[PDB]
Short mmCIF file of C-alpha atoms in Angstrom, two decimals:
data_model
loop_
_atom_site.label_atom_id
_atom_site.label_comp_id
_atom_site.label_asym_id
_atom_site.label_seq_id
_atom_site.Cartn_x
_atom_site.Cartn_y
_atom_site.Cartn_z
CA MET W 1 -12.58 2.10 -9.42
CA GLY W 2 -9.02 0.94 -8.97
CA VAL W 3 -6.60 2.82 -6.72
CA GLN W 4 -6.50 6.57 -6.09
CA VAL W 5 -3.14 8.00 -5.03
CA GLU W 6 -3.15 11.22 -3.01
CA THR W 7 0.15 12.66 -1.86
CA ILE W 8 0.92 13.24 1.81
CA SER W 9 4.62 14.25 1.57
CA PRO W 10 6.85 14.53 -1.53
CA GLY W 11 9.53 12.02 -2.46
CA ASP W 12 12.44 12.64 -4.78
CA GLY W 13 10.01 12.88 -7.71
CA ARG W 14 12.42 10.93 -9.91
CA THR W 15 12.82 7.33 -8.71
CA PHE W 16 9.73 5.13 -9.13
CA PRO W 17 9.50 1.39 -8.35
CA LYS W 18 10.00 -0.92 -11.33
CA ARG W 19 9.10 -4.57 -11.82
CA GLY W 20 11.16 -6.94 -9.70
CA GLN W 21 12.42 -4.28 -7.30
CA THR W 22 11.85 -4.71 -3.57
CA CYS W 23 9.86 -1.84 -2.04
CA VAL W 24 10.63 -1.02 1.61
CA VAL W 25 7.62 0.74 3.14
CA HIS W 26 5.91 1.69 6.34
CA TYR W 27 2.14 1.49 6.14
CA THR W 28 -1.16 1.71 7.98
CA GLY W 29 -4.33 0.06 6.66
CA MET W 30 -7.80 1.28 7.59
CA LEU W 31 -11.36 0.44 6.66
CA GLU W 32 -13.48 3.13 5.03
CA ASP W 33 -14.79 4.26 8.43
CA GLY W 34 -11.21 4.79 9.64
CA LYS W 35 -10.75 1.68 11.80
CA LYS W 36 -7.14 0.49 11.55
CA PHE W 37 -6.77 -3.19 10.72
CA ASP W 38 -3.01 -3.45 10.01
CA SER W 39 0.11 -1.33 10.46
CA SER W 40 3.82 -1.94 10.02
CA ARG W 41 4.44 1.09 12.26
CA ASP W 42 2.78 -0.58 15.25
CA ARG W 43 5.26 -3.43 14.74
CA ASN W 44 8.06 -0.84 14.34
CA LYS W 45 9.44 -2.78 11.38
CA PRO W 46 9.16 -1.75 7.70
CA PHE W 47 7.36 -4.07 5.30
CA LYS W 48 9.13 -5.33 2.16
CA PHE W 49 7.56 -6.71 -1.00
CA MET W 50 8.71 -7.28 -4.58
CA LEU W 51 6.86 -5.30 -7.24
CA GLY W 52 4.98 -7.50 -9.70
CA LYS W 53 5.04 -10.71 -7.65
CA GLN W 54 1.44 -10.21 -6.44
CA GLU W 55 2.57 -10.53 -2.81
CA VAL W 56 0.26 -7.55 -2.14
CA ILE W 57 -3.20 -6.53 -3.33
CA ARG W 58 -3.56 -5.11 -6.83
CA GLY W 59 -4.08 -1.59 -5.48
CA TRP W 60 -0.62 -1.76 -3.90
CA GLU W 61 1.05 -3.07 -7.07
CA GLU W 62 -0.32 -0.26 -9.22
CA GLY W 63 -0.45 2.46 -6.55
CA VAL W 64 3.03 2.10 -5.06
CA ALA W 65 4.44 2.00 -8.61
CA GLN W 66 3.21 5.59 -8.94
CA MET W 67 5.13 6.80 -5.87
CA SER W 68 8.64 8.23 -5.83
CA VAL W 69 11.28 7.15 -3.33
CA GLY W 70 10.69 9.02 -0.08
CA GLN W 71 7.05 9.84 -0.83
CA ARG W 72 4.26 9.32 1.68
CA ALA W 73 0.85 8.95 0.06
CA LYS W 74 -2.74 7.91 0.72
CA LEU W 75 -3.92 4.96 -1.39
CA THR W 76 -7.70 4.50 -1.60
CA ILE W 77 -8.38 1.06 -3.06
CA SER W 78 -11.75 -0.28 -4.22
CA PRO W 79 -12.66 -3.91 -3.40
CA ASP W 80 -11.87 -5.26 -6.89
CA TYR W 81 -8.27 -4.05 -6.34
CA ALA W 82 -8.42 -5.32 -2.76
CA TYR W 83 -10.04 -8.29 -1.00
CA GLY W 84 -13.18 -8.24 -3.19
CA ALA W 85 -16.60 -9.65 -2.36
CA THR W 86 -15.19 -12.28 -0.02
CA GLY W 87 -12.98 -9.91 1.99
CA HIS W 88 -11.11 -11.51 4.87
CA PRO W 89 -13.79 -12.45 7.41
CA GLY W 90 -12.93 -11.17 10.86
CA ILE W 91 -10.54 -8.54 9.45
CA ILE W 92 -11.81 -7.10 6.15
CA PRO W 93 -15.58 -7.07 5.47
CA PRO W 94 -17.17 -7.92 2.12
CA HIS W 95 -16.89 -5.34 -0.67
CA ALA W 96 -14.56 -3.14 1.38
CA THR W 97 -12.87 0.02 0.17
CA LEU W 98 -9.53 0.33 1.96
CA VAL W 99 -7.38 3.36 2.77
CA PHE W 100 -3.62 2.92 3.14
CA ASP W 101 -1.10 5.46 4.43
CA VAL W 102 2.12 4.33 2.72
CA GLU W 103 5.65 5.74 2.90
CA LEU W 104 8.19 4.42 0.37
CA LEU W 105 11.44 4.38 2.35
CA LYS W 106 13.82 2.90 -0.24
CA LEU W 107 14.11 0.38 -3.07
CA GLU W 108 16.24 -2.77 -2.82
#
């Protein structure tokens, strides 16, 4: 599997991120059992990344591209679209399916 996108709150339904645009998001990352491992909200600062530059995992590149500006959505990302077999030891276990709560605040 790749990334499943499941809406939490609707965006404008019209403006979707394109290649080279900077996405401004708030996010929370959890393991499949629900343990949080990362969150921009706990730092109280939105996270920015440029679509297509592979600054984020593949599930983010292809999942956030499906979101409209203002939308909050749940991204469920299989390990191939994620940290894979290796994971990130001490943070992300091997072969880990990840669940992200992502809100697309604006595009820059």
